[PDB]
A = this chain, B = another copy of it.
């Protein structure tokens, strides 16, 4: 499994992460992304969030093995 987090202050709110992997990232009240759950257990859902991570224009998303 992997821990997933978005740096709110660093996120610029473009939402490509939520467009690429809505199963992990959603946009909140304040226009920033956040993960729906702080962990991902399935591999291909990991692949889904990793693509979103790698397309972040400011590297606000981090995914690390738990």
Question: So how many copies of this chain end up in the complex?
Answer: 2
Interface of A is mostly: loop
Q: Which residues of B contact A23 (CB under 8 A)?
A: 37, 40-42, 44-45
Closest-by-CB residue of B relative to A38 is B36
Q: Which residues of B contact A36 (CB under 8 A)?
A: 37
Taking the closest CB of chain B, its distance from the CB of A2, in whole angstroms, is: 11
Taking the closest CB of chain B, its distance from the CB of A4, in whole angstroms, is: 11
Q: Which of B22, B42, B47 contacts A22 (CB 8 A)?
A: B42
**Residues of A in contact with B (beta carbons under 8 Å apart):** 1, 21-23, 36-37, 40-45, 47-48
Known A21-B42, A44-B44; 10 more pairs at CB < 8 Å: A22-B41, A22-B42, A23-B37, A23-B40, A23-B41, A23-B44, A36-B37, A44-B45, A44-B47, A44-B48
